[PDB]
């Protein structure tokens, strides 16, 4: 996958949000781990 790079896990809502429709992520591996609302 595609390597979301993250500062913090408020650095993962916007493409996180934007791709599911829900800022749920989590910045681990430093990559953002989105969950959204699935």
Partial sequence: IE????GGSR???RPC???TGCPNAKCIN???KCYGCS
């Fill in 3 to 6: 390597a979301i790079r993250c």
């Fill in 30 to 32: 430093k990559t953002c």
């Fill in 11 to 13: 650095d993962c809502y």
């Fill in 17 to 19: 949000q934007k791709r």
